[PDB]
């Protein structure tokens, strides 16, 4: 047996685990089986430049043949809406190689995409073709009395993601299956907790976004969302290949992945192209699960399913809050903040970075690779009597044999202390090889009853 804590984590490392198993009686689809299912059209804009340079037109008039639609009075683009699109095309210009250009057709260009507006609700609150029919890269919403949605588009609401969603739709991806409900979908992750195409709301899955009376909808393009449109048209590794910090005090220059306040509501994935990057969401005040596992996902805000790491991304450092959050890492070097309150960090792979900050902290270790004596973790503000260290994962509560110097007889540990540089160290021996294998090192007295092993 282990101890709650490592189940916690144990649990949460597998909470949203995808395929080879069934889900409300729907066969559940790895991220890559749903980037299939996602472009099953065999639909997409053309090229050997290697990129896809799309130009785009707000329609000042209606085109040619325009009445025959059957969708009554044409308008253009307001500016809202204009100022809105674009944050839409370049939401997806970050994640695959695809370019947006505002401009009219022109002889250079992989294809053209046109907005506009219609009045008759005969029409449907916003339509899109796929990139290899007549009316390639078109897109339609409706604005009348009875349907303002579309009418102030902003973060978070639907008036944006219904234009995240017909731009993706006009790139190559289709609606993730063909009164229909979640009921009749093909897959059991077809949920807007996972895609922005889908239909169907978070519940269906789980996840829980906002309460009864208020929306909550994804500005950018989610887990599934990304995954299909590179596969499409490849990564854009260039865009933030610099240091950035997503959420709270965030460095990314997108609304999605912006908070300033406790109340704020994050639904997104995050896409990335290199450098040293952080996750803090050190604002918010309810318990978190931040996983910064690459297509992983979090329980952001208060909410949950709400944040995941795109796939194929490397994030290396995570901040929860001042609630009970818990951190799991990855195989990288990890800073690790649980920021305030009692919360269980799991460093991983690497020399982690591990701050409890104030509260009664647990750092837990699953592995002696997680914590080896060539490579150990760090607990920079460790303190003693409160905080504890997990060895459970390891020991399975067979407990440990604190001694001075190792006796080549396994579960042999020390705790060791340095007064003249506040430094102490727990060492084990888990192999019973004479020498340690196993090494974490604190700033702040680790007592041998700080062990929970
Ligand atoms: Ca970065
Ligand atoms: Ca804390
Ligand atoms: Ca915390
Ligand atoms: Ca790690
Ligand atoms: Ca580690």
């Known amino acids: ?53 799309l130009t785009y037109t707000f329609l000042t008039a209606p085109p040619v043949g325009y009445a025959s639609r059957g969708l009554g009075t044409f308008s253009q683009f307001s500016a809202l809406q204009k100022e809105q699109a674009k944050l839409s095309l370049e939401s997806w210009a970050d994640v695959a190689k695809v370019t947006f250009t505002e401009g009219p057709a022109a002889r250079g260009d992989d294809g053209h995409m046109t907005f506009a507006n219609f009045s008759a609700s005969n029409g449907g609150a916003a339509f899109a073709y796929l990139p290899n029919s007549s009316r390639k890269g078109e897109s339609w919403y409706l604005i009348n009395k009875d ?60 996840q829980v976004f906002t309460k009864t009376g208020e929306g909550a909808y994804a500005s950018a393009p989610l887990l599934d969302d990304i995954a299909a449109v590179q596969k499409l048209y490849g990564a854009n590794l260039e865009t933030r290949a610099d240091d950035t910090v997503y ?19 994050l639904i997104f994935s995050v896409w990335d192209g290199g450098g040293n990057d952080t996750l803090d969401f050190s604002g918010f005040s309810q318990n978190q699960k931040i996983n910064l596992t690459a297509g992983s996902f979090s329980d952001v805000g208060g909410m949950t399913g709400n944040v995941s790491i795109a796939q194929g991304v490397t994030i290396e450092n995570a901040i929860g809050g001042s ?27 690497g020399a982690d970075v591990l701050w409890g900050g104030t509260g009664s902290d647990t750092f837990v270790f699953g592995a002696v690779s997680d914590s080896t004596p060539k490579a150990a973790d760090i607990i920079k503000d ?4 409160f905080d504890k260290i997990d060895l459970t994962a390891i020991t399975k509560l067979g407990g440990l044999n604190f001694v001075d110097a190792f006796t080549g007889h396994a579960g042999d540990a020390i705790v060791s202390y340095h007064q003249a540089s506040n430094a102490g160290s727990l060492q084990v021996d888990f192999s019973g090889q004479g020498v340690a294998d196993f090494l974490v090192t604190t700033v702040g007295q680790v007592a041998t009853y700080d062990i929970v092993a």
Do not use: C
């Open 1 to 53: 047996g282990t101890s709650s804590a490592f189940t916690q984590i144990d649990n949460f490392s597998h909470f949203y685990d995808r395929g080879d198993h069934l889900v409300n009686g729907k066969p559940s689809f790895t991220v890559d089986q749903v980037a299939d299912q996602l472009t099953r059209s065999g639909a997409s804009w053309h090229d050997n430049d290697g990129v896809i340079n």
């Open 147 to 206: 349907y303002q949605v579309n009418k102030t588009p902003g973060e978070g609401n639907y008036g944006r993601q219904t234009l995240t969603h017909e731009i993706g739709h006009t790139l190559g991806l289709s609606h993730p299956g063909d009164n229909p409900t979640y009921r009749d979908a093909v897959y059991a992750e077809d949920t807007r907790a996972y895609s922005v195409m889908s239909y169907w709301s978070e519940k269906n899955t789980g």
């Open 247 to 265: 959420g709270f005090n965030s460095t990314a220059d997108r609304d999605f992945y912006s908070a300033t306040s406790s109340t704020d509501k």
């Open 323 to 349: 609630g009970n959050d818990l951190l799991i890492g990855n195989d990288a070097a990890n800073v690790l903040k649980g920021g305030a309150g009692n919360d269980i960090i799991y460093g991983g792979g």
């Open 382 to 385: 460790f303190q003693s009597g």
